[PDB]
């Protein structure tokens, strides 16, 4: 199983932000999409998961062609999406969000589902918040719950969009352990982020976009040490 | 599971529209009548004297309006694009709207049929149209769900205006087709049971989206 | 300009909810008058000009307390205040698009509301409210409603004040506000505050009062007690 | 030229979250508030600026009993705020937001505001975003706009809650440079984020909270030299 994106394109109202950027995630490979501010990284994610009408491109897994499938029929097959924006349920509780995503996993028993959710709540150090609702939280708790219910559905491959926004550097390490555990268990994670020091520590290959130009792609050591990456993105 | 959210906004909009004019019109009788005349069965009559037919029609109105408010304030909080990101469908929202729409259809049946003796007595002193209300409440709960796919990008009343406008172009034509003929077994042009199934395909072609 | 921003948002939501109320109350009376009487054009054009004068002060609350609710949902009014702004948004922003828009109704209610339903009064010959100038009450009371239509004429000050007092329930929120629970109680709050305002008409002229301050009787007190 | 918070306490519906983290900010100072999630950070900013009520509290700018003064009164007395949540005027533009903040200052002139908006658009690199709609931004783009928006009101004191949420490191360098410029211009700043290696690298001193208790204090040198921060927050 290998998800591959081909030749993506978008021009919002004349402003072109995506111009022929083709990415790939293999069978269980942590892939980076690190780029500067406003560089269409979520816009690439929009087109890959099929939120918006792209101009031209191909989202082909090469065992399926999902170039014009909707949001769900490519995510029903195992391609998960995590929104950058604050996308938690607003009124349901943490246990409610987790068990509502896990209600839809119709391949287990509900006791095993609740045991899975107890693994989740113990796992993200959030289990004391079983009672609190969605908007009765803050930024870190919302990100931990969003990642928890997104990883709860267990797609074949997942596209993360700044999971490390407003979280303390210890839960970053927790999510690092969980991402590496699931990559060992066969999940190919694509991620954009801006916490560079704790982002490059987990990656395996790194598509590096700028304006619609893939200015680098390689091992995170030479991604750190490239003089054009240090020109465009690091400084 | 958003049926509590739709029912909450539903009761909100029904409460607003249940106040909005006939509470003034009940004030105009009762609030001056503590010095003028104090009966029970004059001020008590204004319920069935003012709101049989407004309460008959106001439930598809508050129905589609509250569902549009709730589902729009799921898309603009970007959360049904997580529900729908978990391999869901619009049809699960259609089933949720069907649960809400049968909760609204039973209130429709309450405020026509069982109060029929009460309404007929306290007002008097088309049965095709009477059974139109099942699909009249199913159509808009079927129809708001695709049109309110609108996102945080340009989300405004460019869908709320067709949501009201199609309610209008349906309902005034339904009253014009009820206007012909008469009452009971009097036979008009038989098209009042056709036009809702005509708009069925209107609520289907912009919804199924193949 | 944030004044232009909140003015444009409330100025469009007032049009949308105004269309909802007006183009629903037309089809309220249309169906049962076509059931009773036995050509929708002049029926709608008679229903509309004495509904856009009626429901607009009852749609300002489903305007500036709903569109501003969606505005406050994104946490923008707290940033307005935190950037150096105050309660001045209510008066010096929302009235900037309220008093022209209710100035429309207080112009229509003389220009083409009464005389524009007078064509329906003319059409009553083919078919099957105390609204006149200052000279009507002079020989109406002399031969009662001692300038009770001072309220119906100079409504828009109290029409402003009834939402000036109610809008503090939305720009003073609790932040644990789902808004579909609380702004409807905030609307029903001020709902009576322009209706019990009116049914208390004879409550001060039951002993005798100059109607200048006898058609202002809780309205002068509402914005007095409601400055925050 | 001096502010000191005192006696701060809040109980969100029975459960207490803050117990007397009495902080201090002075003019010409860059202060941090690092700590884990749920540690009364955003709650403390709410109690200072006026978004929530309190249990006890004393807010004095050199004589001031603004401790019971409301949200708009405190922001008139000179406390600036930036929200954790995304807080942009949606349908406006970036120039519209900056000029609309400049319309609040009715003490400058109609040319000075244009000059200041031009300076801020040059510094935040958002000149090519001047045409962009408010809600048409993307994450850290919007956060740079919100930072410049807090700058544009220009009070004597500014309290910043996660201004480094998903922003590119070159613009982090630029924002840190502007904060150093305003500190050299004589302003008081209370920042918090979870960017350790740039939040401590700018702060004159910092506060360390944990679940409502100010479990440490001091200059970021001894914050790094503190052993208990890796025990709770740092890692």
Curated annotation (Swiss-Prot), chains A, D:
Entry keywords, A to Z: ATP-binding, Cell inner membrane, Cell membrane, Cytoplasm, Membrane, Nucleotide-binding, Translocase, Transport
Coiled-coil ranges (or none): none
Xref: SMART domains: AAA
UniProt key word Cell membrane: yes
Residue sites binding ATP per the record: 35-42
Compartment(s): Cytoplasm; Cell inner membrane
Membrane topology: Peripheral membrane protein
GO molecular-function terms, A-Z: ATP binding; ATP hydrolysis activity
Key word Cell membrane present: yes
Enzyme Commission number, as recorded: 7.5.2.-
Subunit structure: Component of the lipopolysaccharide transport and assembly complex. The LptBFG transporter is composed of two ATP-binding proteins (LptB) and two transmembrane proteins (LptF and LptG).
Family, as annotated: Belongs to the ABC transporter superfamily. Outer membrane lipopolysaccharide export (TC 1.B.42) family.
Name of the protein described by the UniProt record: Lipopolysaccharide export system ATP-binding protein LptB
Recorded name of the encoding gene: lptB
From Swiss-Prot, chain B:
InterPro entries the record matches: LptF, LptG/LptF_permease
Spans through the membrane: 11-31, 49-69, 96-116, 131-151, 157-177, 189-209
Cytoplasmic side: 1-10, 70-95, 152-156
NCBIfam families according to UniProt: LptF_YjgP (TIGR04407)
Subunit structure: Component of the lipopolysaccharide transport and assembly complex. The LptBFG transporter is composed of two ATP-binding proteins (LptB) and two transmembrane proteins (LptF and LptG).
Protein name per Swiss-Prot or TrEMBL: Lipopolysaccharide export system permease protein LptF
Organism whose genome encodes this protein: Escherichia coli (strain K12)
Function: Part of the ABC transporter complex LptBFG involved in the translocation of lipopolysaccharide (LPS) from the inner membrane to the outer membrane.
UniProt keyword Calcium present: no
Pfam families cross-referenced by the UniProt entry: LptF_LptG
Gene: lptF
Record lineage: Bacteria, Pseudomonadati, Pseudomonadota, Gammaproteobacteria, Enterobacterales
A GO biological process held by the record: lipopolysaccharide transport
From Swiss-Prot, chain C:
Key words of the record: Cell inner membrane, Cell membrane, Membrane, Transmembrane, Transmembrane helix, Transport
Protein's cellular compartments: Cell inner membrane
Entry GO CC: ATP-binding cassette (ABC) transporter complex; membrane; plasma membrane; transporter complex
Membrane topology: Multi-pass membrane protein
First-listed, main subcellular location of the protein, grouped into a coarse class: membrane
Alphabetical GO biological process terms: Gram-negative-bacterium-type cell outer membrane assembly; lipopolysaccharide transport; transmembrane transport
Residues that span the membrane, as ranges: 10-30, 52-72, 92-112, 153-173, 189-209, 211-228
Cytoplasmic side: 1-9, 73-91, 174-188
Residue ranges, Periplasmic side: 31-51, 210
Keyword Membrane on entry: yes
Family of the protein in this entry: Belongs to the LptF/LptG family.
Subunit comment: Component of the lipopolysaccharide transport and assembly complex. The LptBFG transporter is composed of two ATP-binding proteins (LptB) and two transmembrane proteins (LptF and LptG).
Stated role: Part of the ABC transporter complex LptBFG involved in the translocation of lipopolysaccharide (LPS) from the inner membrane to the outer membrane.
The protein's name: Lipopolysaccharide export system permease protein LptG
């Amino acid at each position: 199983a290998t998800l591959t994106a081909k030749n993506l394109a978008k021009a919002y109202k004349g402003r072109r932000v995506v111009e022929d950027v083709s990415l790939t995630v293999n069978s269980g490979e942590i892939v980076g999409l690190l780029g500067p501010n406003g560089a269409g990284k979520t816009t690439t994610f929009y087109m890959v998961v099929g939120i918006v009408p792209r101009d031209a491109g191909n989202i082909i897994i090469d065992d399926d062609d999902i170039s014009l499938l909707p949001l769900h029929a490519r995510a029903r097959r195992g391609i998960g999406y995590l929104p950058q924006e604050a996308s938690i349920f607003r009124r349901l509780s943490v246990y409610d969000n987790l068990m509502a995503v896990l209600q839809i996993r119709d391949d287990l028993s509900a006791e095993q589902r609740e045991d899975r959710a107890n693994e989740l709540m113990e796992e993200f150090h959030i289990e004391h918040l079983r009672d609190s609702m969605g908007q009765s939280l803050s930024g870190g708790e919302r990100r931990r719950v969003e990642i928890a219910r997104a990883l709860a559905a267990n797609p074949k491959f997942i596209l993360l969009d700044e999971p490390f926004a407003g979280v303390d550097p210890i839960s970053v390490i927790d999510i690092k352990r969980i991402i590496e555990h699931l990559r060992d268990s066969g999940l190919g994670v694509l991620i954009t982020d801006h916490n560079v020091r704790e982002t490059l520590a987990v990656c395996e290959r790194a598509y590096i976009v700028s304006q619609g130009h893939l200015i680098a792609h390689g091992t995170p050591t030479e991604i750190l040490q490239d003089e054009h990456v240090k020109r465009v993105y690091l400084g | 599971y958003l049926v509590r959210e739709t029912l909450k906004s539903q009761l909100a909009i029904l409460f607003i529209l249940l106040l909005i004019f006939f509470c003034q019109k009940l004030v105009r009788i009762l609030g001056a009548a503590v010095d003028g005349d104090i009966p029970a069965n004059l001020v008590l009559s204004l319920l069935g004297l003012g709101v049989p037919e407004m309460a008959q029609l106001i439930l598809p109105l508050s129905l589609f309006l509250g569902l549009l408010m709730t589902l729009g304030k799921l898309y603009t909080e970007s959360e049904i694009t997580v529900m729908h990101a978990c391999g869901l469908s619009k049809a699960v929202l259609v089933k949720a709207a069907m649960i809400l729409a049968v909760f609204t259809a039973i209130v429709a049946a309450v405020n026509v049929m069982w109060a029929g003796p009460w309404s007929s007595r306290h007002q008097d002193e088309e049965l095709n149209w009477r059974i139109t209300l099942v699909f009249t409440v199913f159509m808009m709960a079927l129809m708001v769900v695709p049109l309110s796919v609108v996102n945080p990008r340009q989300g405004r009343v460019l869908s709320m205006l067709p949501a009201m406008l199609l309610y209008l172009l349906f309902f005034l034509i339904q009253t014009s087709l009820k206007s012909n003929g008469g009452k009971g077994k009097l036979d008009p042009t038989l098209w009042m049971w056709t036009v809702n199934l005509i708009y069925l395909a209107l609520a289907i072609v912009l919804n199924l989206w193949d | 300009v944030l004044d232009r921003y909140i003015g444009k948002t409330i100025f469009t939501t007032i049009m949308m909810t105004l269309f909802m109320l007006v183009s629903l109350s037309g089809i309220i009376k249309f169906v049962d008058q076509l059931k009773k009487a036995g050509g929708a054009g002049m029926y709608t054009l008679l229903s509309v000009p004495k509904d856009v004068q009626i429901f607009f002060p009852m749609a300002a609350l489903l305007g500036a307390l709903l569109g501003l609710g969606m505005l406050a949902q994104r946490s923008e009014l707290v940033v307005m205040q935190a950037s150096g702004f105050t309660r001045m948004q209510v008066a010096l922003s929302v009235m900037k698009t309220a008093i022209p828009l209710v100035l429309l109704t207080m112009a229509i209610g003389e220009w083409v509301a009464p005389q524009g339903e007078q064509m329906a009064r003319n059409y009553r010959a083919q078919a099957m409210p105390d609204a006149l100038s200052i000279s009507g009450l002079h020989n109406y009371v002399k031969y009662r409603y001692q300038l009770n239509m001072w309220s119906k004429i100079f409504q828009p000050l109290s029409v402003a004040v009834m939402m000036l007092m109610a809008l503090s329930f939305i720009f003073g929120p609790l932040r644990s506000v789902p808004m579909g629970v609380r702004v409807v109680t905030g609307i029903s709050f001020g709902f009576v505050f322009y209706v019990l305002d009116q049914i208390f008409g004879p409550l001060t002229l039951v002993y005798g009062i100059p109607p200048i301050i006898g058609a202002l009787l809780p309205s002068a007190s509402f914005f007095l007690i409601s400055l925050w």
